[PDB]
């Protein structure tokens, strides 16, 4: 496996893990007491 595909797999897992945090914290901020 060339590390260009490993590079795209690395940033892809970074963005997919890093976007869902914000919608988790938005649901948990809007519809919860604290």
């Amino acid at each position: 496996i060339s590390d260009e595909q490993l590079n795209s797999l690395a940033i892809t897992f970074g963005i997919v893990m890093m976007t869902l945090i914000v919608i988790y914290h938005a649901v948990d901020s809007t519809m919860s007491p604290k």
Partner: protein
Amino acid sequence: RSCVLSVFQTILKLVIFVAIFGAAISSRLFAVIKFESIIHEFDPWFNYRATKYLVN
């Protein structure tokens, strides 16, 4: 309402841990798929010499 929101929190946390257990694994591996897979430096070649004694 409480069951719906609680199930949503649980499933979303499971998908979070499946992603963030994978981003680390994929970030460490440039020196293994670039080259062969061998122990790297001066100090980690005693430890490998001792856990190969215990193991047989």
